[PDB]
Amino acid sequence: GSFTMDLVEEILRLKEERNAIILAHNYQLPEVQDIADFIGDSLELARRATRVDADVIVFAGVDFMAETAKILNPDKVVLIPSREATCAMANMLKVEHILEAKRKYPNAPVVLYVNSTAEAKAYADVTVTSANAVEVVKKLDSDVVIFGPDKNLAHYVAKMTGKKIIPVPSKGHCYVHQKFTLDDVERAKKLHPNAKLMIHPECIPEVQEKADIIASTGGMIKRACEWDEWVVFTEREMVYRLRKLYPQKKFYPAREDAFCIGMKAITLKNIYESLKDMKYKVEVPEEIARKARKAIERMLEMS
Ligand SMILES: C/C(=C/C(=O)O)C(=O)O
Ligand code: SF4
Ligand SMILES: [Cl-]
Ligand SMILES: [Cl-]
Ligand SMILES: [Cl-]
Ligand SMILES: [N+]
Numbered sequence: 001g002s003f004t005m006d007l008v009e010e011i012l013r014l015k016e017e018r019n020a021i022i023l024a025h026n027y028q029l030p031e032v033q034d035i036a037d038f039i040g041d042s043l044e045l046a047r048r049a050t051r052v053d054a055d056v057i058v059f060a061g062v063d064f065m066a067e068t069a070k071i072l073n074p075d076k077v078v079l080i081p082s083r084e085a086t087c088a089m090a091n092m093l094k095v096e097h098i099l100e101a102k103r104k105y106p107n108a109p110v111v112l113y114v115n116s117t118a119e120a121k122a123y124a125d126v127t128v129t130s131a132n133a134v135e136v137v138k139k140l141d142s143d144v145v146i147f148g149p150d151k152n153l154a155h156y157v158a159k160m161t162g163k164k165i166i167p168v169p170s171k172g173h174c175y176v177h178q179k180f181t182l183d184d185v186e187r188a189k190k191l192h193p194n195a196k197l198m199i200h201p202e203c204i205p206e207v208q209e210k211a212d213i214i215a216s217t218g219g220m221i222k223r224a225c226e227w228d229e230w231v232v233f234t235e236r237e238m239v240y241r242l243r244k245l246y247p248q249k250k251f252y253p254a255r256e257d258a259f260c261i262g263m264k265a266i267t268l269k270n271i272y273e274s275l276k277d278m279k280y281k282v283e284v285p286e287e288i289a290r291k292a293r294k295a296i297e298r299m300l301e302m303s
Contacts, residue, residue, distance in 0.1 A: 007268045011035055014275035020056035022271065023048060023069065026217040027235040027263040028060045032271065036060055039241065041218030042068075042114045042129040047300060049073060058274050059282070060266045062087045066282045067118045071292045078282040081274040085265035089174040089202075090115040093149035097168040098123045101146045105166055108144045111137060112295070115174075116149060118284045121292035130201050130216035132303035134160040139302060148172050156201040156208060176260045177202035180233050184254050185210045188231040192252055195229040203233055221245060235260050 005013065012035075015022065023045055024036035033039055038048050042065065049057070049069040056077045059066035062085045070078040093116050102110065102123075112124035113133070121127060128136045130153060137145055137157050144164040147154050149172030158165040180203045188197065198220045199211035208214055213223050217238055224230060224246055232239050233254040242251045273279070284292070 007272050008035055011268070011272050011275060014272070015058075018056045018275055018278070019054050020058055020275060021052060021054040022058045022060055024060035025062070025065060025263065026221075026241045027237045027260050028266060029237065029264060029268075030240045031268050032060050032266055033237075033241060033244070035268070035271070041131060041216045041221075043131040043216065043303070044218050045069070046072070046114065046129070046296060050300065052076060056275075056278075058271060060271060061085065062090075062262050063282070064090045064115060064117060067284055068114060068292075068296065070282045070284050071118065071121075071289045071296060074284075074286075074289060077278065079274045079278065080280050080282050081267070081270035082265040083280050084262070086262045087115055088262065089149055089172055090117060092169055092172040093117070093120050094169070095119055095123065097148070098146070101166050101168050105144055105146060107142060108146045108166060109140045109142055110146045111140070113148060113150055113153060114296075118288050118292050121295055122288040124292070124295040125298070126302065127292075127295045127299040129299075131218050132299065133157050133201075136299065136302050137161045137163060137165075150174060150202055152177065152204055152208070153201045155205045156214060174202045176235050176258050177233075178204060179258050180204070180207050180254055182206055182210070184233070188252070188254055192229065192231055192250075195231045195250070195252065196227045197231050197233060197254075198223070199233040207233065217241070224249065234258070235263065237263070 022036045024039045049072040058079050066080040109125040114129045138161045146166045148168035154165045154167050196212035198213050229250040231252050236253045236258050239251050239253045
């Protein structure tokens with residue numbers, strides 16, 4: 001015919017030409033999810049980055065996630081389609097916060113949420129995500145741990161493990177998940193009285209306390225089989241992910257306006273441009289990468 005390739009067809013050809021895999025987070029735009037080879041949460045993306053047979057990883061997610069993939073694949077090309085795909089919560093944690101906490105608690109393990117920079121991870125004894133933070137902290141050989149950046153996840157970990165949690169920094173949080181309120185819980189239950197509530201641990205504690213399940217986005221997918229109707233208290237693109245996986249269930253956003261600007265820096269067009277031009281190359285300095293890798297590997301061994 002007269003027509004040629006659209007962006008999807010161009011991307012598919014370039015993936016072949018580059019020997020590339022596209023890894024996407026659950027918060028990516030639906031049309032980006034639809035072209036990804038693998039979609040998952042922070043822990044699943046970290047694990048998947050340890051079995052990459054491709055030469056090139058295009059990371060449809062934020063920069064810290066691409067850096068984690070690069071730390072696990074120092075000799076593969078890792079591309080981030082936009083350097084403005086970044087995480088507001090992760091940037092709240094600086095090396096100075098970690099050093100001050102280590103000074104006060106030298107025997108406390110430093111436990112850093114994967115939502116953190118590579119420089120910060122170089123000071124972690126182990127990394128965690130929302131899916132394994134409780135399990136990891138429970139198993140660490142200390143009754144006190146230094147933990148960050150997210151204070152709402154820290155609250156959940158403190159509740160579930162009974163251990164003393166020293167937050168770094170003092171007020172780290174995700175603006176997307178902080179948008180959920182008790183009024184959103186009330187409205188969701190009024191509009192969808194037969195639905196259960198799946199709530200991310202980055203939400204505030206009083207909202208966590210209303211959950212039927214508290215889970216990472218990966219845990220939400222794992223536990224969705226437990227009911228047929230769910231209100232989803234996380235970034236709104238997760239509703240698309242859940243509807244695609246389970247077309248027979250019903251999913252409703254807790255708030256349509258819970259959007260991550262950094263995640264939406266990734267577009268179909270800049271994924272195309274990323275493969276076409278081999279950009280933007282993600283690099284992590286060797287000393288930081290080796291130290292971060294030790295903490296990330298330990299995390300994968302512990303969960
Ligand atoms: C936002 C997020 C973070 C994580 O997995 O630790 C999630 O995908 O649940
Ligand atoms: S949703 Fe929140 S934690 Fe995730 S990248 Fe966006 S700002 Fe960061
Ligand atoms: Cl692969
Ligand atoms: Cl995220
Ligand atoms: Cl199913
Ligand atoms: N011990």
